[PDB]
Design a protein around this ligand. Sequence first.
Ligand SMILES: Nc1ncnc2c1ncn2[C@@H]1O[C@H](COP(=O)(O)OP(=O)(O)OC[C@H]2O[C@H](O)[C@H](O)[C@@H]2O)[C@@H](O)[C@H]1O
Length: 189
Amino acid sequence: GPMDFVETNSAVYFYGQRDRKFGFLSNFYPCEFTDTEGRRFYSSEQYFMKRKQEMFDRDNEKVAIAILRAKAPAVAKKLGRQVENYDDEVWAEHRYEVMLEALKLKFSSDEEMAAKLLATGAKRLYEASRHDAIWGIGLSVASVTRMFRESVSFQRTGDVDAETRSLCFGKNLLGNALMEARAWLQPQD
Ligand SMILES: Nc1ncnc2c1ncn2[C@@H]1O[C@H](COP(=O)(O)OP(=O)(O)OC[C@H]2O[C@H](O)[C@H](O)[C@@H]2O)[C@@H](O)[C@H]1O
């Protein structure tokens, strides 16, 4: 509903796989794709978590199987939080590009999903997750809605300004990765 996203002329603030319009931007959104080696994934979430286990605990049979079986994205996530030999410095260096790969597989798997991401044009994309300030901005959709309502200027440009983003928003690695996937999906002829 209207309380589940903010959309302006220049921005989309989304959260969650359920919204009928923007649900597809969520990494929990159900889909189906295969990697080159032929493993099957049912969300971008699950693939990202498999690549985390592969990076830190590659030979762990139980954990590899459990992630490949984790069709429920929240189960994949929790397994990902439990991956052993985790090194944050190393994951922080590599995790954006892993996510961008996940998104390339996901959006490549369905032309309708691809068309939906392209239909967002050049709008800036932000995951409005209150609890995730790495993949999202660490604010809820309601919080963002109050920022807009109290600012005639955000209302005029359709987005919060860069200084505000630098002080108020988390890293939004997902929104950034989606905008890079969207660029990658642009027609080349
Ligand atoms: N195995 C681990 N052991 C230790 N700490 C960990 C571990 N994994 C994560 N951390 C800690 O958790 C932090 C974040 O780890 P990242 O893997 O980037 O993300 P996410 O696990 O939040 O999953 C993000 C996905 O799930 C959401 O739906 C999003 O939208 C994405 O799709 C690290 O910096 C560590 O502090």
